[PDB]
Nucleic acid binder design. Structure first.
Ligand SMILES: [K+]
Ligand SMILES: [K+]
Ligand SMILES: [K+]
Ligand SMILES: [K+]
Ligand SMILES: [K+]
Ligand SMILES: [K+]
Ligand SMILES: [K+]
Ligand SMILES: [Mg+2]
Ligand SMILES: [Mg+2]
Ligand SMILES: [Mg+2]
Ligand SMILES: [Mg+2]
Ligand SMILES: [Mg+2]
Ligand SMILES: [Mg+2]
Ligand SMILES: [Mg+2]
Ligand SMILES: [Mg+2]
Ligand SMILES: [Mg+2]
Ligand SMILES: [Mg+2]
Ligand SMILES: [Mg+2]
Ligand SMILES: [Mg+2]
Ligand SMILES: [Mg+2]
Ligand SMILES: [Mg+2]
Ligand SMILES: [Mg+2]
Ligand SMILES: [Mg+2]
Ligand SMILES: [Mg+2]
Ligand SMILES: [Mg+2]
Ligand SMILES: [Mg+2]
Ligand SMILES: [Mg+2]
Ligand SMILES: [Mg+2]
Ligand SMILES: [Mg+2]
Ligand SMILES: [Mg+2]
Ligand SMILES: [Mg+2]
Ligand SMILES: [Mg+2]
Ligand SMILES: [Mg+2]
Ligand SMILES: [Mg+2]
Ligand SMILES: [Mg+2]
Ligand SMILES: [Mg+2]
Ligand SMILES: [Mg+2]
Ligand SMILES: [Mg+2]
Ligand SMILES: [Mg+2]
Ligand SMILES: [Mg+2]
Ligand SMILES: [Mg+2]
Ligand SMILES: [Mg+2]
Ligand SMILES: [Mg+2]
Ligand SMILES: [Mg+2]
Ligand SMILES: [Mg+2]
Ligand SMILES: [Mg+2]
Ligand code: NA
Ligand code: NA
Ligand code: NA
Ligand code: NA
Ligand code: NA
Ligand code: NA
Lengths: 48, 57, 103, 128, 95
RNA sequence: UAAGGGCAGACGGUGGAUGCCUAGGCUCUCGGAGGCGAAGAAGGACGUGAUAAGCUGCGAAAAGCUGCGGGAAUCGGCACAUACGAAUUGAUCCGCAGAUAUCCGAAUGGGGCAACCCGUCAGGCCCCUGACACAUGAAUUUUCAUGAGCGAACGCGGGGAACUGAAACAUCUCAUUACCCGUAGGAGAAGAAAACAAGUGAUUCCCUCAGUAGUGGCGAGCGAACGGGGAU
RNA sequence: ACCGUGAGGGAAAGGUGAAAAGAACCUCGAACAGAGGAGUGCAAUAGACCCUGAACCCGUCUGCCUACAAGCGGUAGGAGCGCCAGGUGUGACUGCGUGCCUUUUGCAUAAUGAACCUACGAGUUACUGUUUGUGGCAAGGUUAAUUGUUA
RNA sequence: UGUAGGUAUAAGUAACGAUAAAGGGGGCGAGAACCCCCCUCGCCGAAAGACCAAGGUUUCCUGAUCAACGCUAAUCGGAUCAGGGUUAGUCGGGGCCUAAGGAUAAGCCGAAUGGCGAUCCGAUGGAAGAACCGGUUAAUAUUCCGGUACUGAUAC
RNA sequence: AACCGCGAUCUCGGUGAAAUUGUAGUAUCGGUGAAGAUGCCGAUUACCCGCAACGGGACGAAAAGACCCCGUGAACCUUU
């Protein structure tokens, strides 16, 4: 059967990418919280 | 369906009473002087009932 | 930190199995604070024939430097050393047992 | 000096024992124990034949362990063994470290799989 | 400065045996064909006829420590296959 | 007769409890300091070693370059390495001052799916590369100066719940709390009487006054001030 | 690390030895797969998962008992046998005996709960009252904030 | 119905994942039902053959290795380690254009954070400036080579 | 209802889980009893240990009954 995750790199970057996060005040809030926690993977842009 | 209780060591061992490895049926073949399975070809010399059955070069 | 011994110095072992024996310093391991004294603390190493034919090799193992004392040039005895600027404005090592400059 | 004296006593004692050990054999201790119980107390040459022709898989490793024990006896006694002279005087199988694995089960459940190992010890001696 | 090392391999040896004007280099990943041609010409005093390039991503590798495993990676590079003019040559063994 | 079994002792197996140990935490004290950033930050990407780099350092000058001072024999970072070199004509190392410092990121030449794509004008080379400049907004008269973004707590300001308590619940409480947002400084706020009182004499903080006066479905609860003693 | 599209959630994991002196060489074996030796070392039953090395759990050996016997498995008697000088192992045979916790008027209960072991796990502290034991002063008792000296 | 770790019991039990199917002879090897070669047999064949895209990311080829992984063993492997391997003026994309939508200018609205709002961004569409034939590797080919051509800029 | 074929099944070699589990040397009958007993009482029957087969009991397993009532529990829906 069809499962919930149907991968698309363009959609992944458009939805959760670094520039998508920086475009909004709440996205920058997410980035600041992740930096404060010390995540090695800031966004899905860091992954490969 | 389900065990009401775990089995004790005694009960388990009593069931395992009849678990045993089987001894092979071994003949001596007094000529070659070494063991082989009764009613099989003697794998070293290749003989069987005093006749060369398998010749190995 | 500057150590109280150095390569080329004659030292006396004052503690351990080789206590009472003198020798020459061949190398100093500063981080571990140890030194190789020639002829002392011999060990047998089982060396494979890899090399480059193996065998049992006798060689010196290092000693802790707090077990080594400089030999006094006058009386040939272990002694604590000090430092003074008597040599033309340069600091030199000298033996507190006698006073002669260590060299 | 205490531990040196204890070790010297044990080292002297070991000179009169003739044994071999297999450690960390990656197989079931129970299945190995079946073979051990089959050959316990048996003369060494018959035991070698039995292990060579046995229908269990573990007998192949037991045979090489037995050969090693006979060689240890021969070295410690400084002579070759004769015919029918040696017998399997002791044998034991112990459990050893287990590898833990995961196997998927229906409806998203995961079950644990144990891959067991054993040790085997064999002592030989003369039928005195 | 962009040329890192030459390519010595069975494929390169066969290519040079069959052509004798064709050589291979490992260069910086961000150098273009004109830059590679100029660097090779300046380094070896020859006339370069053609340059072929392919970009290689570094291999992912496993670094083994006492505890266990760490995932690591090798550096990415670019392969430059350089063909010279007829009769020209470059020596890698000499000097 | 023990196929097997029961109990005890001895000796092993497994497993990793216990004891002993540790600079890794926790709570504080004292003294400083209280920012970083368009001269490009925080945080990253990619590189960089004789040999693959996991960390560390560093940036195409890439485990490093220069000077001054200190010091005097080893040094070439760590993950149980060797080789090969440096160094008494003073290495390595330490303090201070300098040089270099790729790409992304406020990112600022225009775009963009971060670490990429595409340009314009002048200048030096020969399709293509190396050094400039090229954003916006409030001041200033094209020039000049500032700003933007990030970041611990403490300050001020703009908005502002509910569960809960009242043994239900709506006034009330929780609470001018949580939380969101804006914006300073080493502190901030307050502060020099159109004041308190029935003599004192600007603010702020501490101990009392005092769970007092009051307030309140006068329920649950909430709760001062004058005066006095101090810090200043 | 792993899990999640994402916001986010979020582990386990310390100890050879004083010093690597980290086991040359021999034997069995295709192989160190593993072991027996030799050698190093105070010690290798400190041999790399390495200090100590418990329980549950799993084995081997030795002693005694056991194939006419029926219920919480113990407890109180009591031969014989076996070890080492009046102790210790076993237990022919006999009497008595429906675990434990919790919740209940009342539970062997066919009410609840636990596979077992090791480790972890639940009336604490602050302030303010009140009573009391014991004290210091006493018609009086007591300082708070703070200040001085040396610390 | 407490938590972590370890170890039991059920138990050598359920099960080893489509009933398309296997047999023999040689080879190598310490070890072979399963690996390699040959013969025979069987299954798919609008596929269970051959390609493009998404997605994955070295799984590709070779040499060593058989501890772990592979529901058995293994000399084998999409496994471990090391080395090698992807070649374009013409193929695909990008560079150019715009759709939905998004970000904005002048302006509008609004405690704050901000919400709107015609040029720019944005393919799943429109342009691209432009070939085939043959051969060759262990692993690439319209890319390498031999022919045959064509296209765009540039100096006479 | 009978018979037939293959897969599962059974036996052997290899690998090897789970639910469940206070400890158990865990028989029957009638009594007794928190009122339906392997475990209590009195009788009766029964040499020790497996394998195949079936499901009567272990108020068998599983999910702190959804029915019912209770809590000055909750949510959602309606309305003069
Ligand atoms: K290319
Ligand atoms: K030890
Ligand atoms: K110790
Ligand atoms: K133990
Ligand atoms: K009894
Ligand atoms: K019940
Ligand atoms: K329960
Ligand atoms: Mg059986
Ligand atoms: Mg196994
Ligand atoms: Mg077999
Ligand atoms: Mg699934
Ligand atoms: Mg017994
Ligand atoms: Mg023990
Ligand atoms: Mg530079
Ligand atoms: Mg921009
Ligand atoms: Mg209420
Ligand atoms: Mg092997
Ligand atoms: Mg010991
Ligand atoms: Mg130990
Ligand atoms: Mg009878
Ligand atoms: Mg009897
Ligand atoms: Mg009741
Ligand atoms: Mg009762
Ligand atoms: Mg209940
Ligand atoms: Mg239960
Ligand atoms: Mg119960
Ligand atoms: Mg319990
Ligand atoms: Mg428990
Ligand atoms: Mg349960
Ligand atoms: Mg069963
Ligand atoms: Mg299944
Ligand atoms: Mg089956
Ligand atoms: Mg197909
Ligand atoms: Mg392959
Ligand atoms: Mg191979
Ligand atoms: Mg396997
Ligand atoms: Mg491979
Ligand atoms: Mg456009
Ligand atoms: Mg191919
Ligand atoms: Mg069955
Ligand atoms: Mg079987
Ligand atoms: Mg009844
Ligand atoms: Mg009954
Ligand atoms: Mg019952
Ligand atoms: Mg039930
Ligand atoms: Mg209930
Ligand atoms: Na027995
Ligand atoms: Na830019
Ligand atoms: Na050994
Ligand atoms: Na349970
Ligand atoms: Na495709
Ligand atoms: Na792809």
């Amino acid at each position: 059967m069809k499962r919930t995750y149907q991968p698309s790199n363009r959609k992944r970057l458009n939805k959760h990418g670094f520039r998508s996060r920086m475009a909004t005040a709440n996205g920058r809030r997410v980035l600041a919280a992740r930096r404060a926690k010390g995540r090695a993977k800031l966004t899905v842009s860091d992954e490969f | 369906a389900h065990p009401k209780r775990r089995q004790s060591k005694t009960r388990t061992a009593k069931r395992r009473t009849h678990d045993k490895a089987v001894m092979p049926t071994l003949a001596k073949c007094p000529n070659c002087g070494a063991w082989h399975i009764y009613h099989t070809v003697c794998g070293d010399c290749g003989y069987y009932r005093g006749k060369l059955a398998i010749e190995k070069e | 930190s500057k150590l109280h011994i150095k390569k080329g110095d004659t030292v006396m072992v004052i503690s351990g199995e080789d206590k009472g024996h003198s020798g020459r310093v061949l190398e100093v391991l500063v981080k571990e604070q140890r030194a190789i004294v020639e002829g002392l603390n011999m060990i047998k190493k089982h060396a494979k024939p890899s090399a480059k034919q193996g065998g049992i090799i006798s060689k010196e193992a290092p000693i802790h430097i707090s077990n080594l004392n400089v030999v006094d040039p006058k009386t040939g005895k272990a002694t604590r050393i000090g430092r003074r600027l008597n040599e033309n404005g340069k600091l030199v090592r000298y033996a507190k047992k006698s006073g002669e400059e260590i060299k | 000096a205490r531990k040196h004296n204890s070790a010297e006593a044990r080292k002297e004692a070991l000179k009169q024992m003739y044994f071999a050990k297999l450690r960390n054999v990656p197989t079931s201790p129970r299945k190995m124990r079946l073979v051990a119980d089959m050959i316990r107390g048996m003369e060494v040459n018959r035991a070698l034949g039995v292990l060579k022709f046995s229908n269990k898989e573990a007998s192949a490793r037991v045979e090489k362990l037995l050969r090693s024990a006979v060689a240890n006896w021969e070295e410690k006694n400084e002579r070759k063994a004769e015919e029918g002279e040696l017998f399997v005087s002791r044998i034991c199988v112990d459990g050893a470290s287990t590898l833990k694995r995961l196997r998927p089960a229906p409806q998203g459940r995961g079950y644990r799989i144990r891959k067991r190992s054993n040790h085997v010890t064999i002592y030989v001696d003369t039928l005195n | 400065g962009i040329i890192i090392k030459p390519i010595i391999s069975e494929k390169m040896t066969a290519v040079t045996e069959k052509m004798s004007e064709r050589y291979g280099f490992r260069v910086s990943p961000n150098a273009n064909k004109i830059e590679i041609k100029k660097a090779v010409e300046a380094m070896y005093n020859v006339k370069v006829e053609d340059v072929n390039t392919m970009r290689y991503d570094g291999k992912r590798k496993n670094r083994y420590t006492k505890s266990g495993l760490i995932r690591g990676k090798e550096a990415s590079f670019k392969k430059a296959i350089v063909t010279l003019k007829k009769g020209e040559t470059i020596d890698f063994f000499s000097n």
